[PDB]
């Protein structure tokens, strides 16, 4: 009988983190620590629904005026406006000049996808899939995939993490910018670089911006941690705002997964900043055609929560407090880990633990050192030495610090 | 003076649909009727949040045990299981034989998109964009767009609507099936054909299935109105179930937008039926890669409401009553319009109004007659002659019938 039409479909290779996590789960050892987690966790190792979010969800549930009719293709107007305003600031020259557009998308991933699809059709000519796209070395796992799927043929890397110095390879980054073909697209992490936690300082950003301006390089910002990163919304959007100030046209993929803890409601926004107002209408008209054939129109729940929060001063104030709580817990785990490592007179420098920003940290541990932590200490992390600071608690900090100290001194 | 990178982006052409609603919205005329609407409306012309949905939303809102952590890439397990079972029936052999898979998607549109991307990569060879894709004449406009975007180069039409007979052109359809190259993909409406409202009878479906089986044509079902169509969930899924019983391997894109009235929560499911269990695992593995790069993972709200309703016998029962209420109102409008048009002794045969199923009806009016209805009577409908029966109410029912009589009589 005719074989299945699916007879030759291969089994896709599984992603590492999934296994690690499964592994972790199945470990009987009471001392087990999961540093491979990809989301915020409390001091009790639990997920955290923000108090303001719970509050807003109750208000929504009790709002009888709400219906479930389709939203416009581009999304809930109030959400698009509030989201763009959060990234750029109320006083943004671009907002005031009406040269900003926002497209509600399925998380930061959907925003990146829509933006990449637009660029593959209308940027640097028509249907030009040859424009080089540059991603940091290393970068969030899905960057390559989104761009590849949008049809970009030439995906490159720019030097970023310096393994020996455990910091930013600024000279390498600047050389890659200098050698990039004009109009190349650069995917930039706004703040809280994922996975390293290493960000350029404002002064370094100015250097980066200089080369981009001169060579007509396009800034495609990925902003998934605004406010979550430092507790300060304005500080966290500094680099985006600087580029705007400097007159760049850019895209900014915003995720509300982390800063609102709305991971599973898939709330994102693609902010577009153009040189002229008229361009916005034309660009959004094209974004609509791309959305229509992808998800048709976006979901309402997540966007309604975000729009409600950001537009009510009392709720806004409360949310800023909730964000600060998360940021503060991370700062705390970083300072505590570093202190302990140093108290143990651990070989090497560990100031990177506190210089880095956000949930993720490139520890500088090597693969052999990682193997030892998992196998022997029941401490789960990626082979890259990447850890999630939220996997640390007041209760396991000693264990982890001591185990790292062993790995470093005993393993080569 | 560096020009904008968006300087040459064209303004996308607007969607007629959108124009009309907008036109309608502005109509000063007190008698104006919008038969252009694309969602359910009550006899008062209001959106309707199903009672069971309001009930479950309150239950969700008060369930302190729910968090907002990312769902698995393929979606909420319980939702996928329930959604597939709804289409196939509890006793489906495919379910018993475990050769069914479901992918939670962003409405029926998202399910079609994921399905099309999978076929463009792994069906009838690898990366074969030349397999013909067949859509009905006419069809839901987004059909072409989704398949084109997925990469298919050869999109064909199969005869379906007979303008003269105001019914299904079965012989045309069958010839188109007979002439299609082996392995061609056929996009089939499960029930409540959009936009005609004209469905094959079970006997006609058997003739269609016969040819498909012989020529190895792939059935890609689009199921957006299950239950909503006839008021009975079982009747409406018959065609799908028949093909399963005949041993077809197939895709079924399910939308919960209409039958749950959850338009804005974007709840869909892609059901996959394979010859053997092993294939499902491999196919789903490939599906994950596709989702990952599109929306990453799906939203929870909509899916949770559906899963809760379908898994609770009491809520399920209440839901079936809500669905019948919607279906009954439509049947009532169909019967009434037909009756009035005939009492009016309107020229032409009107049994099609009653023979048609679902929200949408191809009235058979020419664009000339439509022009009039819009210009002269303030009755808004597409130039295709398509109307939404939900735009009719006990209150405008006469006006409309009256106006149709004139149109058909005054213009021709």
UniProtKB/Swiss-Prot annotation, chains A, B:
It catalyses: L-aspartate + 2-oxoglutarate = oxaloacetate + L-glutamate; L-cysteine + 2-oxoglutarate = 2-oxo-3-sulfanylpropanoate + L-glutamate; (2S)-2-aminobutanoate + 2-oxoglutarate = 2-oxobutanoate + L-glutamate; 3-sulfino-L-alanine + 2-oxoglutarate = 3-sulfinopyruvate + L-glutamate. GO terms for biological process: 2-oxoglutarate metabolic process; aspartate biosynthetic process; aspartate catabolic process; aspartate metabolic process; cellular response to insulin stimulus; fatty acid homeostasis; gluconeogenesis; glutamate catabolic process to aspartate. L-aspartate binds at residues 38, 140, 194, 386. Its EC number is 2.6.1.1, 2.6.1.3. PROSITE patterns: AA_TRANSFER_CLASS_1 (PS00105). It comes from the Eukaryota. Keywords: Amino-acid biosynthesis, Aminotransferase, Cytoplasm, Pyridoxal phosphate, Transferase. It is found in: Cytoplasm. InterPro entries: Aminotransferase_I/II_large, Asp_trans, NHTrfase_class1_PyrdxlP-BS, PyrdxlP-dep_Trfase, PyrdxlP-dep_Trfase_major, PyrdxlP-dep_Trfase_small. Gene3D superfamilies: Aspartate Aminotransferase, domain 1 (3.90.1150.10), Type I PLP-dependent aspartate aminotransferase-like (Major domain) (3.40.640.10). Its main location: cytoplasm. CDD domains: AAT_like. GO terms for molecular function: L-aspartate:2-oxoglutarate aminotransferase activity; L-cysteine transaminase activity; phosphatidylserine decarboxylase activity; pyridoxal phosphate binding. One of its GO terms (cellular component) is cytosol. The modification N6-(pyridoxal phosphate)lysine is found at residue 258. Pfam families: Aminotran_1_2. The keyword Transmembrane does not apply. Its cofactor is pyridoxal 5'-phosphate. Belongs to the class-I pyridoxal-phosphate-dependent aminotransferase family. Biosynthesis of L-glutamate from L-aspartate or L-cysteine. Important regulator of levels of glutamate, the major excitatory neurotransmitter of the vertebrate central nervous system. Acts as a scavenger of glutamate in brain neuroprotection. The aspartate aminotransferase activity is involved in hepatic glucose synthesis during development and in adipocyte glyceroneogenesis. Using L-cysteine as substrate, regulates levels of mercaptopyruvate, an important source of hydrogen sulfide. Mercaptopyruvate is converted into H(2)S via the action of 3-mercaptopyruvate sulfurtransferase (3MST). Homodimer. In eukaryotes there are cytoplasmic, mitochondrial and chloroplastic isozymes. This is Aspartate aminotransferase, cytoplasmic. It comes from Sus scrofa.
């Amino acid at each position: 009988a005719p074989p299945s039409v699916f007879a030759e479909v291969p089994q896709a290779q599984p992603v590492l983190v999934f296994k690690l996590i499964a592994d972790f789960r199945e470990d009987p050892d009471p001392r087990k620590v999961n540093l491979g987690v990809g989301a915020y966790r409390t001091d009790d190792c639990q997920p955290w629904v923000l108090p303001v979010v719970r509050k807003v969800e109750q208000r929504i549930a009790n709002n009888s005026s709400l219906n479930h009719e389709y939203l416009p293709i581009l999304g809930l107007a109030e959400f698009r406006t509030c989201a763009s305003r959060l990234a750029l600031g109320d006083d943004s020259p671009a907002l005031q000049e009406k040269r900003v557009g926002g497209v509600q998308s399925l998380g930061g991933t959907g925003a990146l996808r829509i933006g990449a699809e637009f660029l593959a059709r209308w940027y640097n000519g028509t249907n030009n899939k040859d424009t080089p796209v540059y991603v940091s070395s290393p970068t969030w796992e899905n960057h390559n995939g989104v761009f590849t799927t949008a049809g970009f043929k030439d995906i490159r890397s720019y030097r970023y993490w310096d393994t020996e110095k455990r910091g930013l390879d600024l000279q390498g980054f600047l050389s890659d910018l200098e050698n990039a073909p004009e109009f190349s697209i650069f995917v930039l992490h706004a703040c809280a670089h994922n996975p390293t936690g290493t960000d350029p300082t404002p002064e370094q950003w100015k250097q980066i911006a200089s080369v981009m301006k001169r060579r007509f390089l396009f800034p495609f910002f990925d902003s998934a941690y605004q406010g979550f990163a430092s507790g300060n919304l304005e500080k966290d959007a500094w680099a985006i705002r600087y580029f705007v100030s400097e007159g760049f046209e850019l895209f900014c993929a915003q995720s509300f997964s982390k800063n609102f803890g709305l991971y599973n409601e898939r709330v994102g926004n693609l902010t577009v900043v153009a040189k002229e107002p008229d361009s916005i209408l034309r660009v959004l008209s094209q974004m609509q055609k791309i959305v229509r054939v992808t998800w048709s129109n976006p979901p309402a729940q997540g966007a309604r929560i975000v729009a409600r929060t950001l537009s009510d001063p009392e709720l806004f104030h409360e949310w800023t407090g909730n964000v600060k709580t998360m940021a503060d817990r991370i700062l705390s785990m970083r300072s505590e880990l570093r202190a302990r490592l140093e108290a143990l007179k651990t070989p090497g420098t560990w100031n990177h633990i506190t210089d880095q920003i956000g949930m993720f940290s490139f520890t500088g541990l090597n693969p052999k050192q990682v193997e030892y932590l998992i196998n022997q200490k029941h401490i789960y992390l990626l082979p890259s030495g990447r850890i999630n600071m939220c996997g640390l608690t007041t209760k396991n900090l000693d264990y982890v610090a001591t185990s790292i100290h062993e790995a470093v001194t005993k393993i080569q």
